[PDB]
Design a binder for this molecule. Structure first.
Ligand SMILES: CN[C@@H]1[C@@H](O)[C@@H](O[C@@H]2[C@@H](O)[C@H](O[C@H]3O[C@H]([C@@H](C)O)[C@@H](O)[C@H](O)[C@H]3N)[C@@H](N)C[C@H]2N)OC[C@]1(C)O
Ligand SMILES: CN[C@@H]1[C@@H](O)[C@@H](O[C@@H]2[C@@H](O)[C@H](O[C@H]3O[C@H]([C@@H](C)O)[C@@H](O)[C@H](O)[C@H]3N)[C@@H](N)C[C@H]2N)OC[C@]1(C)O
Ligand SMILES: [NH3+]CCC[NH2+]CCCC[NH2+]CCC[NH3+]
Lengths: 148, 46, 195, 203, 97, 52
RNA sequence: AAGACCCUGUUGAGCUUGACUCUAGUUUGACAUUGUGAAAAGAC
RNA sequence: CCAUCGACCGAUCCUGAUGUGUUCGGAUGGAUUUGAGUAAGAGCAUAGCUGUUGGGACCCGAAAGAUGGUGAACUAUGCCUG
RNA sequence: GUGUAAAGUUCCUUCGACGAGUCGAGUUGUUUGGGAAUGCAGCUCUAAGUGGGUGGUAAAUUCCAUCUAAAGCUAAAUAUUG
RNA sequence: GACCUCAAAUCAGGUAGGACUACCCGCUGAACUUAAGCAUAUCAAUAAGCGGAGGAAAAGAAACCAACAGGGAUUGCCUCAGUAGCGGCGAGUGAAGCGGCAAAAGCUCAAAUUUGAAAUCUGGCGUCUUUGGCGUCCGAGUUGUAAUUUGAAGAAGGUAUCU
């Protein structure tokens, strides 16, 4: 609200906080990103390195849907098991009856290998998997099943 | 004055460039002796 | 005009943008009016449902394959499986799409099942129908009554079967095979015919 | 019928028979007024394809239009601006000669509606077109369920609004990625993309 | 059909294939006994275009490459040039008989 | 200008918090009196009346 | 009478030219408009 | 939370096992290199002061430039009639 | 109710016409986010019949996918300083 | 005496123009301004100028999007996204497919021998129960007016005898 602004406090003081010498003017230094290579180089080269120039190749008509592949790590994998049956599955899963985790159905494209799994066999269904993620799943007696 | 004519202006009255103008000059340039094969007093016969 | 450490902004306000400002002050009014329009439209044709029955289709785009949604209309082959002519289906509240095709079997079966459920719940009136029967039906909401259902993710328990080749290696080999498929067949062609 | 033969013959514009016919008809059309009434279509199959019927209330006009581009009509070539706008020659009109023919005929016969038009002939100076016209007031048209639609006032001078085939062509009214800018009207799409939409609970 | 995995050649999920009756709109390119008959009469009445006659004589002089380069110039694309030169050879293959 | 901000978003959970806090305050007689209500002849709050 | 002289401003304008960048006009060629013959030099 | 030596992931350089569409694969071990990374998450949302950029942009102020119109009752010049 | 009239469905056989100075190509100008050229327009060239268009890097060769131009009508959701 | 083409009439009956401005369909088209100068660029495919509508207009039932396990006329909102891209690659600029919703609606010709029958239509006259019906006479029309078909098909011959 306007009653909290310093405009109210500057009433009665000549320059409104803008100085007597500098004399707040319209656009000293230009408009927008003017002079980024000339008189604003000392700002851009310090706080925005990399600003000027071209790097890499162009990609005409990029469709972002081609690259949809959300990641899930191993340490978060068991959140996808039904919460009502998570405690039962941990104690009862074995090589004959292991939980099936459909990562794609939950919105994920690749399983990554960060963290530690429960020492419980799991059947993990995924479009993609990292090398370490599959080794850790196979080490707790589980398996990775590729889907499409 | 120079607005009025290609010959206008100067601190003396003078043309300042050749008054013989090419046949291929455009309107506003053709003042003087247009496409003159020669100039000056004719002496002898023709 | 460039100053202390701050993100570089892209504010596109260099045209006469104030001549083209649209403030939706009428959001609540349009909500109420759109609601009255639905009310009158339903009252006009009762007890026939307002909404035509719509099919269930997969969504395109590897980002949206997992999803299923309502499509535009049932295909000619799907209606043919139930025995309904395309021109007749439009008069009994069934949407028709001549553009969609049925390459696979799963969506075809799902929509044939939808058509059979709808046709089993359908009651057509005629001249022999008395107003007592007509007054006995309420205006059903077809979209809610026949909803689109996501097929469930696989859950539960199953035996663990471990192949000798890892899934990561399978992905790597599939990529390599695709990448060099064109040049390995060219090396093959130029070799068999010469030898 | 003969219409298929006429269709296939009219595609052979460089054969001796068609060259002879086009030469003589170009001379004949060039000897008459720039706009004149045609007693009948000179290409009856082409007229049929575009919606014409040999009924009372269907009218054919012929018109020639001058060929070439559009010289910018500024005095002595001065544009009074930046060099990017200094061009006078090699400029082009954004509507086609077909649309110009349709519009001039529509102005001459202001009691009629322009249905469609087609090319008939061509020389270095003129292109010749034939314009199909329909009389909204004629009872043969007002009683015809296949042509009643044009009586409605929303089709008043549809050729002046680019609503005919040639007009819709020049407006860029077509489907797909090649027509993103003009698909639903160029100016409409520009206005939509340059409107700041503010809701009550700004998000 | 599809391989069942997310990468490689013929990638994608497996579905049970269903036969599709081809749409009638997919026959657009096919010729009919109507058009073939009409077009052959019209070629008798009309004759040849001047560039086609220039192109017959190139083939007769055994200038195969010379005819293709003119046909591409006149028609616009290399694909249409290939069809036209082939057609104009068959015209010669019908004068000998 | 008309495109001033007129309406304000509030998180729905926080709005519900405020509703619950307001209902709880209605059972405290000191707050009801300081609010300015003439409730001095009511024995207890909440005041509940039969469904008739 | 917010110097008309002088200076400053990355403020102009009138005028000039072998300034930078263009332009109406004009000229030159090709193609189209554009058809029907003959003789003589050329090339497959 | 700080200083310091490591370890993990991506880029770069090197090494190069079992194997092969024999040119692919890339086990394994190294490198004063490199990243807006990891190493038991901290974010999202609303509001307020201050600061930033685009907007008439704290208020008033050019000389100019453009588009479309109105004037030869003054005056300049030709013409017609006195 | 002129219901030997009209229309609808399934199956078999033979067929199955489908828009040209247009498509397309070159060039010029303009325009577009459209980048060896997005649309539009002028001029030159000028088609075909499983052909034609499109598939966001120019070209030839081989496939594949997807529609069916150059003719036409049509409520609603959308706009609204009159 | 026909026909074709072209005229005339204060011929019988109609129709157009002009106005309004917020929104709508097109044509034409700047510069101030920003780039701390400036010419490409920007302002802007904007203002001014011109033509044409309606209660909405335009668009619209794929010569579409896609590359998926595929969607399925048009339009709008949210998002995509200040992104792919364009740009003295500077200042700046900048869409689309998908996804969620609002609303949902589909179709018509040309190209076909009715050929055992122009089956079609304007007008005049008479008449009536008059947004028109009936009868009749000219005219239009075979250089093609009706019925039949529009690619999702469909047609011509058979069909189960069914609705
Ligand atoms: C390959 N040689 C490595 C040498 O590169 C170095 O390893 C660095 C390591 O020090 C860097 O790590 C450095 O920077 C990271 C920061 C970037 O996250 C800090 O977290 C870390 O404390 C710091 N030491 C790490 N980012 C890359 C390794 N290659 O460590 C010594 C070494 C073994 O000789
Ligand atoms: C308790 N274990 C800790 C573990 O939590 C973690 O601690 C990090 C520590 O390494 C980080 O610190 C690290 O990275 C910072 C950074 C500014 O570059 C540097 O000081 C330096 O590279 C390094 N010490 C510190 N910034 C946060 C702690 N939680 O790092 C490993 C550890 C030291 O064993
Ligand atoms: N609204 C601006 C009208 C002028 N057009 C200029 C922009 C055109 C874009 N050119 C970019 C370079 C060509 N791809």
């Amino acid at each position: 609200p306007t009653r909290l602004t310093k405009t109210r406090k500057h009433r009665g003081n000549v320059s409104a906080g803008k100085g007597r010498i500098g004399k707040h003017r319209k656009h000293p230094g230009g408009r927008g990103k003017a002079g980024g290579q000339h008189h604003h180089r000392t700002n851009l080269d310090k706080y925005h390195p990399g600003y000027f120039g071209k790097v890499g190749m162009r990609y005409f008509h990029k469709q972002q849907n081609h690259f949809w592949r959300p990641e899930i790590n191993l340490d978060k994998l068991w959140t996808l098991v039904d919460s009502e049956k998570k405690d039962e599955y941990l104690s009862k899963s074995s090589a004959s009856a292991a939980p099936v985790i459909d990562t794609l159905a939950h919105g994920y494209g690749k399983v990554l290998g960060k963290g530690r799994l429960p020492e419980v066999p799991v059947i993990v269904k995924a479009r993609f998997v990292s090398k370490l993620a599959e080794e850790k799943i196979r080490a707790v007696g589980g398996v990775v099943e590729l889907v499409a | 004055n120079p607005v009025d004519h290609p010959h206008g202006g100067g601190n003396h009255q003078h043309i300042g460039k050749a008054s013989t103008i090419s046949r291929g000059a455009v309107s506003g340039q053709k003042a003087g002796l247009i496409a003159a094969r020669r100039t000056g007093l004719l002496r002898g016969t023709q | 005009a460039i100053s202390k450490n701050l993100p570089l902004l892209n504010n596109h306000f260099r045209k006469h943008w104030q001549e083209r400002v649209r403030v939706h002050f009428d959001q609540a009014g349009k909500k109420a009016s759109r609601r009255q329009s639905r009310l009158r439209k339903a009252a006009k044709i009762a007890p026939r449902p307002i909404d035509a029955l719509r099919p269930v289709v997969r969504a395109p785009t590897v980002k949206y394959n997992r999803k299923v949604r309502a499509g535009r209309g049932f295909t000619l082959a799907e209606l043919k499986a139930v025995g309904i002519a395309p021109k007749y289906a439009r008069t009994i509240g069934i949407s028709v799409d001549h553009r969609r095709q049925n390459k696979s079997q799963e969506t075809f079966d799902a929509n044939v099942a939808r058509l059979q459920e709808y046709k089993s719940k359908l009651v057509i009136f005629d001249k022999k129908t008395k107003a007592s029967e007509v007054a006995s039906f309420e205006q059903v909401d077809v979209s809610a009554t026949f909803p689109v259902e996501q097929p469930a993710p696989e859950s539960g328990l199953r035996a663990v079967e471990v192949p000798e080749q890892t899934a990561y290696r399978t992905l790597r080999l599939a990529r390599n095979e695709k990448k060099y498929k064109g040049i390995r067949e060219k090396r093959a062609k130029e070799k068999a015919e010469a030898e | 019928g003969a219409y298929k033969y006429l269709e296939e013959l009219q595609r052979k514009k460089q054969s001796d028979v068609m060259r002879f016919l086009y030469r003589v008809r170009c001379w004949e059309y060039r000897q008459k007024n720039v706009i004149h009434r045609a007693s009948r279509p000179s290409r009856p199959d082409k007229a049929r394809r575009l919606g014409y019927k040999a009924k009372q209330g269907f009218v054919i006009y012929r018109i020639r239009v001058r060929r070439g581009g559009r010289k910018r009509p500024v005095p002595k070539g001065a544009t009074y601006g930046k060099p990017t706008n200094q061009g006078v020659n090699q400029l082009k009109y954004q509507k086609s000669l077909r649309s110009t023919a349709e519009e001039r005929v529509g102005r001459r016969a202001s009691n009629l509606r322009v249905l469609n038009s087609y090319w008939v002939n061509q020389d270095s100076t003129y292109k010749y077109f034939e314009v199909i016209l329909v009389d909204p007031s004629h009872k043969a048209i007002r009683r015809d369920a296949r042509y009643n639609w044009i009586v409605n006032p929303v089709h008043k001078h549809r050729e002046a609004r680019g609503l005919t085939s040639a007009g819709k062509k020049s407006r860029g009214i077509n489907k797909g990625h090649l027509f993103n800018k003009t698909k639903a009207g160029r100016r409409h799409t520009w206005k939509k993309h340059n409107t700041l939409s503010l809701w009550r609970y700004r998000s | 059909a599809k391989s069942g995995i997310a990468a490689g050649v013929n990638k994608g999920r497996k579905t049970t294939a269903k036969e599709v009756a081809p749409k009638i709109s997919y026959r657009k390119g096919a010729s009919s006994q109507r058009t073939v008959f009409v077009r052959s009469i019209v070629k008798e009445v009309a004759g040849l275009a001047p560039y086609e006659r220039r192109l017959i004589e190139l083939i007769r002089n055994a200038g195969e490459k010379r005819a293709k380069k003119l046909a591409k110039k006149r028609l616009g694309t290399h694909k249409r040039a290939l069809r036209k030169v082939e057609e104009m050879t068959q015209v010669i293959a019908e004068s000998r008989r | 200008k008309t495109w001033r901000r007129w309406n304000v978003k509030v998180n729905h959970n926080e709005k519900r918090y405020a509703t619950a806090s307001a209902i709880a305050a209605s059972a405290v007689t000191s707050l009801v009196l300081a609010r300015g209500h003439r409730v001095e002849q009511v024995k207890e709050l909440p005041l509940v009346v039969s469904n008739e």
